[PDB]
């Protein structure tokens, strides 16, 4: 077996990791204090949950996570939370100054006096693992800290841990849920600084998840808490491939070979179904075909795009719960007869399907109901490039008058970094269209 370490960064990152760990504990049955009455061993090596959690002699389960934040406002609440005895104090690192929505800070001003300590803490967890696969980064492009500090840590690790995979779960900023006016600069800087430090990266449109929570879940004003509970489901469905004894994308290296054909292109679209509310629990029973067909709905997609107007390079379907291959064959045939999608003839990868005998789970009194089946579709299509087009519009307009640019150059940054980052974005956009040439 092989272990894994999740490195969370920023406010959004730390808020998403707590919910993910809570969902994992509710699924595997881990108690708040860290006691698995079903486990019949004291140490890890023969079970299956040892990839994410770590066992000790006293039966305590210490989640393999490295939470690092600059503002202690959120870490103080995360420490005194319900799972105070779960996470180790050494894993939680806090700073003394906030970036205040700035990348040149989270990277050079506030990222220099914290990086020398983050590595010493990550080494303590890396030495305990006999075979580490890679890293599971959780941050957001909007937040200045979550972007700058994450990019600094990523490249810092590229030197030491070079022969290790790298993953990401960023959150694409939206105009409605915007905390900074410099969101476009930080995003275009972090996408260019770590375009080579990420083997695979997942983007979460704040608009798509908000619309999903407002329509599907039927919520008036979905708060960050509700948006984090919904993303936890997708995170668990994605990590089930490595947590359980499955047979599809069991290792982080398999993600770069079955989803990321081109090293440069590493932004695969993801979708998860169904999305039933708690009130309408036993209202309707959707079979595998319905949930598989709902994946092709722009409203249900995690990012606002139009895959219909684009080719497909790699596609991976993952079923969870009561699902039989006989029923999955019906959906596979319907995808071809009813629906129709083209494919890139120059792409090596193709279509893959997998099933896992693990039913879903929801938090007591939550927003989502305990459905009987779940489906997760990961498709790498060029349509996602549209999401990168609008992002370049705002940045370009702002840098046309060079507003809020002096605040970055005067914090350990050069004026040429912006030109380099948008020259890289232009090249990526051009390659996105060149890959989908008839």
């Amino acid at each position: 077996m092989r272990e894994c370490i999740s490195i969370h960064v920023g406010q959004a990152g730390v808020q998403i990791g707590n919910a993910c760990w809570e969902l994992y504990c509710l699924e595997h049955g881990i108690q708040p204090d860290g006691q698995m009455p079903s486990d019949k061993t004291i140490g890890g090596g023969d079970d299956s949950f040892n990839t994410f959690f770590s066992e000790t002699g006293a039966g305590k389960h210490v989640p393999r996570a490295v939470f690092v934040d600059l503002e202690p406002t959120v870490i103080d609440e995360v420490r005194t939370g319900t799972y105070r005895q779960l996470f180790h104090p050494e894993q939680l690192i806090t700073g003394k100054e906030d970036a205040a929505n700035n990348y040149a800070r989270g990277h050079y001003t506030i990222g220099k006096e914290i990086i020398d300590l983050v590595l010493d803490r990550i080494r303590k967890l890396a030495d305990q693992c006999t075979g580490l696969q890679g890293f599971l980064v959780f941050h957001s492009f909007g937040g200045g800290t979550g972007s700058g500090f994450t990019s600094l840590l990523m490249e810092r690790l590229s030197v030491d841990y070079g022969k290790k995979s790298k993953l990401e779960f960023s959150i694409y900023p939206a105009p409605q849920v915007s905390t900074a006016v410099v969101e476009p600069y930080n995003s275009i800087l972090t996408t260019h600084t770590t375009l080579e430090h990420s083997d695979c990266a997942f983007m979460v449109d704040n608009e798509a998840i908000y619309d999903i929570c407002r329509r599907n879940l039927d919520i008036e004003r979905p708060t960050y808490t509700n948006l984090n509970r919904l993303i936890s489901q997708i995170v668990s469905s994605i990590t089930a491939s490595l947590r359980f004894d499955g047979a599809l994308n069991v290792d982080l290296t398999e993600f770069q070979t079955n989803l990321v054909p081109y090293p440069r292109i590493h932004f695969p679209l993801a979708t998860y179904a169904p999305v039933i509310s708690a009130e309408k629990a036993y209202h309707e029973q959707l079979s595998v075909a319905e949930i598989t067909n709902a994946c092709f709905e722009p409203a249900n997609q995690m990012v606002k795009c139009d895959p219909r107007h684009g080719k497909y390079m790699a596609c991976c379907l993952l079923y969870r719960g009561d699902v039989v291959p006989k029923d999955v064959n019906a959906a596979i045939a319907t995808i071809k007869t009813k629906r129709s999608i083209q494919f890139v003839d120059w792409c090596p990868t193709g279509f893959k399907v997998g099933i896992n005998y693990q039913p879903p789970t929801v938090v007591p009194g939550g927003d989502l109901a305990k459905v009987q089946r779940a489906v997760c579709m990961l498709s790498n299509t060029t349509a996602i490039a549209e999401a990168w087009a609008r992002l370049d519009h705002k940045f370009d307009l702002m840098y046309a008058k060079r507003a809020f640019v002096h605040w970055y150059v005067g914090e350990g940054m050069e004026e040429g970094e912006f030109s380099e980052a948008r020259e890289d974005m232009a090249a990526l956009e051009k390659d996105y269209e060149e890959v989908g040439v008839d």
Binding site: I219, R221, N329, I335, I341
Partner: protein, 341 residues
């Protein structure tokens, strides 16, 4: 459980299918069975199901050919570890109280949606399962003519949606329940609910432990329902979406803050936590809205000059509470906008 294609220009790579096929073949380890649209009429020879699948936690007998309730009771007897059950979309014929007890001694969930069951049969069918928590009864046209006595005691959840034959008279019968934490009433046609057994400020013994309440898709057009809801001893949560008052318009938000003002123990509304600032803003808006009405029906800052009619006390019983929380509205706060020439 005991038993190529190309999309566009590429093949489908089904991997791990053999593992799932081998795991599902073991009938002696199926912790969850689902037979939707599988034609299940009878249970078969007794003793076989108890030996082939002696461990079952959840069953989904929805959309089957179950004609009689005895066929379901037979399967429920062999399944000792039956926790969750669902027999929706079945025109079963229940007996006149002949179902013996002990068949469902560990049934925590029971869904009976779309079954044509009546209130007289629900009590007879929930006779052999006192530890029943969830009990769904949606789309049944049930008429609450009787009331529980020795059954339906630990019913933590009671769903009665898609039933346009429920009113306050029928709710009073199922109001003396001891453990009633949830009572869904979506699309029930209800429009008014009062508590004559309690006065202004005093609580009511009906629905004491009613924590979460749902009343979506109803004719809720009066603020008399929200005003009556305050009498409930406990009511931390409420959903009132898609209604004549809380419509999808832009000004509908103005009604939201009103609800938070009509209830004091409302910590969440429509799955949205009400932070202290939100409650303060709602209370301030509610106090500023009826500022003119509070003075029209008598009222002054000095306790000496004060006389509120019964109308203002029954329509706004919580106004006096805010009067002491944020003082009384002065003469300058009652002029937020006026025309000019």
């Amino acid at each position: 459980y005991v038993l190529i294609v190309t999309i566009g220009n590429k093949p489908v790579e089904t991997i791990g299918f053999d593992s799932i096929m081998k795991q599902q073949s073991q009938l002696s380890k199926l912790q969850e069975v689902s037979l939707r649209n599988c034609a299940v009429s009878c249970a078969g020879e007794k003793g076989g199901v108890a030996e082939a699948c002696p461990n079952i936690r959840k069953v989904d007998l929805s959309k089957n050919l179950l004609s009689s309730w005895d066929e379901v009771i037979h399967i429920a007897d062999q399944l000792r570890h039956l926790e969750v059950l669902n027999v929706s979309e079945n025109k079963l014929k229940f007996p006149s109280g002949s179902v013996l007890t002990g068949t469902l001694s560990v049934l925590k969930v029971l869904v009976l949606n779309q079954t044509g069951i009546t209130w007289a049969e629900v009590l007879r069918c929930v006779a052999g399962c006192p530890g029943l928590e969830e009990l769904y009864l949606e789309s049944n046209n049930i008429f609450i003519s009787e009331r529980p006595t020795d059954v339906l005691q630990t019913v933590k959840l009671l769903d009665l949606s898609s039933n346009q034959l429920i009113d306050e008279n029928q709710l009073y019968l199922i109001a003396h329940l001891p453990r009633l934490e949830q009572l869904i009433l979506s699309d029930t046609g209800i429009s008014s609910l009062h508590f004559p057994d309690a006065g202004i400020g005093c609580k009511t013994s009906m629905f004491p432990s009613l924590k979460y309440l749902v009343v979506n898709d109803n004719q809720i057009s009066q603020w008399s329902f929200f005003n009556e809801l305050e009498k409930l001893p406990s009511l931390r949560a409420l959903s009132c979406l898609r209604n004549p008052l809380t419509k999808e318009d832009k000004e509908a938000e103005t009604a939201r803050l009103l609800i938070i003002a009509s209830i004091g123990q409302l910590k969440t509304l429509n799955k949205c936590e009400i932070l202290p600032e939100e409650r303060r803003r709602a209370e301030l808006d509610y106090r500023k809205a009826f500022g003119n009405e509070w003075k029209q029906a008598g009222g002054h800052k000095d306790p000496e000059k004060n006389r509120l009619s019964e109308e203002f006390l029954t329509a706004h019983p919580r106004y006096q509470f805010l009067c002491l929380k944020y003082g009384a509205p002065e003469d300058w706060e009652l002029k937020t906008q006026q025309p000019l020439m």
